[model samples]
Target chain A: MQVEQRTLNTAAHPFQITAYWLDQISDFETAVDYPIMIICPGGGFTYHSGREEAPIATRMMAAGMHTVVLNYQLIVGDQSVYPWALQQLGATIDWITTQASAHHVDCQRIILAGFSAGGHVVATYNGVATQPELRTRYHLDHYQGQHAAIILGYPVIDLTAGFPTTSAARNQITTDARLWAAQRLVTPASKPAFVWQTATDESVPPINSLKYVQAMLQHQVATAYHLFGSGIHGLALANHVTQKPGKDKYLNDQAAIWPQLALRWLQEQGLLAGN
Target chain B: MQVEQRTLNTAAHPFQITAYWLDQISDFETAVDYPIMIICPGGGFTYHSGREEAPIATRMMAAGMHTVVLNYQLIVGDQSVYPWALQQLGATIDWITTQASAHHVDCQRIILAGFSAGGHVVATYNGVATQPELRTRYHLDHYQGQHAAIILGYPVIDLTAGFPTTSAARNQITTDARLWAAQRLVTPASKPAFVWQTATDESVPPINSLKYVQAMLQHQVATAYHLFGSGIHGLALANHVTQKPGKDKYLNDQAAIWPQLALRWLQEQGLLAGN
Candidate 1:
């Protein structure tokens, strides 16, 4: 097994992608190329949550997937902001594909996952990463990688309206707001996705997930959505495995199953191999 | 802890309640009573599912609540039928209360939980247990034991409408079904409830949970409802803890958290004391 933290951030854009992968390959002639899940940790777009990063990667790695935790730039000063993180994401995708053989990953089956505002980032990136306009405008290099699927956990899918849990996130992103939302972006052409949230989430709220799932349904997209009846906002994994000692009040055994649920989904979707 | 399996099934009526309780207590003067949960395992109103029985009880026990697993009468012969099982339930309720002191249970706080048709039983029982008409019809003893709350997991709350998942259950219970439907019976007068199901449940679709939750909301009853995005019917616990080897395909991590969620709600309601 190989675990490496790469600084995807640079003088131009600041971010990081930490990779977890198996170094040993099967002795059989037919080599296996592991599917990859690029994780964008939710910190309401302000900062990357340590809780949502390594804890999640460890679980995904155990499930037989090469995982990358993306510490995307927080909506910071004028130096690092909106399209910068998206550009960094695009670059990360591009970089991962170019180095796919070395990473032992299948460039065709990269999955993007995010939570809360980070969910906004992942959804937006997945929706528009292939758009020629974004590539030219953001000066992002073209990449051959394809998205196998997307997963959003209590995501801030709609950025156009309503009270964002992280109000500062909007200031960091688009103030015009028209281009901020992904509600208009999701369509039948969108990749298969998994979405889940608590019904009583007062923070980012269920409307975010409900609206996204409704759009997916309208598009007839193959999607799965779960509304957990209870739990506060930012319940990362919801169990002992993700507990952060005194900071572990969010530990909920019930809400903790999304990771396994997503893994099973990937397996069923044929993006990840079934054990 | 004491484990005892008693056969309530006799020449009168056939059923059983398997009890799990802590025999020893603290020497402290503030000797508190344990809140009890009577679990009704769902088996399509036919046979009791082993998956839903002991596993659930153990968890509830671990949470400091005394639990009883009900092996309620299935629709077998003319011998074990509709009101018969109900009468058995009444007997079980009476017996538990009469033996409450010995069992170290708080007679005022009994939470009846059921899954599927078993869910139907718990809802119906909670709704009508105090009704003089139901008591007379079922020939059940009038008992003073009060229900603190009710829990339904993918319950069959509405028996009269929408495709009945089990035709035999309908026949065995009532064809005059309007009276059998808990949707009409649920009112503010009804006990608080925790209801859950999956949107993709085909065996006993979510209309059961949705209608029941709607009714509970309309009545201003305290309730919690969750709709898991996807999963097959009979996903008891939905995780490794409840997994049954080759037969254990119901493992769904997302859906598995209902127990913990229900437990917390019980704590918050002050019906079940906090640890």
Candidate 2:
């Protein structure tokens, strides 16, 4: 993938965002202009430089669609408070949509893929909790990309439903719920979400995904929910059988299939033609 | 508060846990010599340490409650899954409960408090998420102590709810469900929680408390919900706005009342006095 990094100032802070695009698209493919998924990684609102961004970028590079990883200022200092995170993300999404032609990607077909905490940002981006008109009030219409599809990777969805308190991580969410709740999230954005997760993710709970998928279905969104066995959190691949031989080798094997599935999803969306 | 560290070996690695006890408690009085809370920090289950264990611990001590901080084997190896996380937590909770009387703490009144991700773990302890029963599960009923209230600071109580995602964190819930569902999480558990958050906490999300409180209400459990405007996660009295701008900070400056309020709560149920 051809990756590029840039800084954008929003809400008085600079957001670090990177775009992952195909290193070289064929003339025909470029002319077709495939769909794009503005990928966001989960750091639980801490930092977004490592595990979240790098791996996702490489995966999207192989997927043939352009992807961008944003390191936002909404996570630290005063900027870390309230709508800061969402606003920064909205700003970046706005920028990407406005510049979609240049990237050989289609803005209308843009998908927001957020894993864990990053899922919260993208979920908010798809008008997560706020109305589109409300977003217009903030002049976010330009950046408003009502996601055609949402791919949440074992995200922490509900702020009120309470997770099983097993470790300090549970308390951290309740304790740090202040600066993070500005986006007014009521449910996943109004779109179909390809929900994937295992019930045994050590970091995040499986119910997190179940709740979102159930909610999405309640809202009549084209949604897909999969409940697996014993793949830990941050496991990017699917169809992982986690018992035995040498610990999580199954998850490691499936890691290679995540991006390919997204690619097929885009193709099924019919966004790969007539660019 | 006097702090001490403890280390244990379960497998190939060493695990760390810390305990905090107050030396002076002439004025305060409760059901036992002292009450206690197990504090956990947040790193998405990535890392945790007792770095600020004292000040928070001291505060708990000032309230006539002993405090214990634990660092368990979290998300260590590929097989280190959710049940695994809970297993370690269950072991710690069980171990501490046993040591309550020796430490002069009301073992029955143990409270689990976590910051961000720590709060997540605490939620798991109480919430309806499934889990492999802790080895000490049978011991909870025989005790005359309380059912263990969860005190979370800007905690992430609701993993299934979407408030955190709306505010700052990402959207990985849907994906998490799919991934973890593959793992067969048939043992979800739910418990009551005492949740609070700073409306202005810069790191986590405030809606986290609201969500958990709602869940408690949904589950027909009484959840104490409090929201302050400024404390960031791990802010620890750094910003002296007269402790809620001289208004008797509902949580911090006035936090002393928590023990009585908390203890009285358990007493009313007659758990502390005896079942």
Candidate 3:
């Protein structure tokens, strides 16, 4: 029953990354056993942009699962590419697992919830990126790592397809969007990805993540997908009333109901065992 | 003035590739004396999702001119991959020049007007792909090629920084509304684009186009940007009330009105001078 935030090193000597912990990012050297969830934000392939995700993490914690929200290098140096971000993610997982005892984490019940591009990174980390790469990226010389499940929050899992079919789509590929996901052509073999896209997602096409789930289905990967009817991608979590008010409800709104559904789902999954 | 959509090697095609042209796609010897414009829809690197651009072409038939709408491949194979679709856009432009004559399209004045991802493709096409590759991928070589001026309707130019945080003080990066763009980002040396976004655009952030215009200023691109106060994306060309209504009869109700402004701007630049 504790929480805090801390930065962990992922790169060599001077370039270690930050591993913001929501429930706790402490060392797991103390004997402990409990479940955990990891959260990441989305900002194209540029930044974490997860301002709304903080509350979501706290809610998850209240539901009885320890949650950790991470922020990593969106683009390393001037490379501004995809593999680098994914590498950082892979490193975060590695650090958490190896240092689980220091943080009182359950090594067996780790769930990843990465939003938008972050969703894509975790998927490939498990589905495409190799075990050695994951270990090396995070400098994890002491931990054994693997995720039990992953939740993709409005991910841009596909870049080749144009979304918003506007000038922005053109610039993504023309300017530098291609540079980020150029190595994409991943097939799912080991991803435990559950994808969701809000029909109204504005940042990246909700289908970006939805399509990844479809590909997962094609490759026999156990993926889940849900498309919300309408609501801002990130803002819905923080302030739902600002959206179509007569229709949808926010988490704090009197008539809001998604929180209940979330509780039920987590409980059924055995993620909620105590008050 | 004449035009027709082209059909190239229909039997050997693997996937669906649709085209729209103003005249017969024929030999390279003929020359069209006027300007041509092509309209592409938006839904974010999606299908020719909007389905409204075709009629806009018919409206463009006079003044020794023609218009064509294309169904370029988008989100094909995978959405998260890199440069796959961008490469196809290049093929589309390459295919246009080869069959310009039959379509009565003046290759010199071929203009591209893209909504969303379509906006991205036309502006990004660099014309280096081989004829065979162009024809096979986007199947454009089988039709009238290339465009002159560019039209960006409520486009998405950048996903990272999005709308300049410093632009309009009202700029919001996140909103409870899902379909609308709440962020915009554009840079110099980004594209040879002419852009426009509504001030009240609720679907895509209007700043998406606004920032492109700002970039156009530094890059010396001839651009006409209009900031309407209302209407969302996917409005028809005739009676769209949400689109900055008919306050003074300056433009039609359904039309983006930006297109109307484009007609005049193109005239001033001599892009539509054959009229």
Better lDDT candidate (1, 2): 1
Instruction: Candidate 3: list runs displaced more than 4 Å.
Output: A1-5, A12-32, A75-77, A129-143, A163-188, A236-275, B1-275
Q: Superposing every Cα of model 3 onto the true structure, what RMSD results? A: 22.2
lDDT by residue for model 2 over B1-275, one digit each (tens)?
56666543211223566787756446757434666677777665556733335556656565556777867446545334244344445545645654554567666567777766677656655542222243233122111233356666566555544333442222332223321221121122444456666677644656666666665676566567657555455443333421345544323554334445545565564334522
Give the CAPRI rating of model 3.
incorrect
- Report lDDT per candidate: 0.72, 0.55, 0.51
lDDT of 1 at B174: 64
> Which portions of model 1 miss their true places by more than 4 Å?
A1-275, B9-12, B25-30, B160-169, B176-179, B246-249
Deviation in Å, model 3, residue A120 alpha carbon: 2.5
Clashing pairs in 1: A237-A256, A238-A252, A254-B257, B9-B14, B238-B252
lDDT of 2 at B142: 19
All DockQ scores:
0.01, 0.01, 0.01
Interface quality of candidate 3 as DockQ: 0.01
- Backbone clash total, candidate 3: 57
Question: Model 3, range A242-274, lDDT digits (tens) per residue?
Answer: 344564433333213444554555555555454
Q: What does fnat come to for each candidate?
A: 0.00, 0.00, 0.00
Top candidate when judged by lDDT against the true structure: 1
C-alpha RMSD by candidate, in order: 16.0, 20.7, 22.2
Candidate 1: lDDT over CA atoms? 0.72
What's the residue-level lDDT of A106 in candidate 1?
82
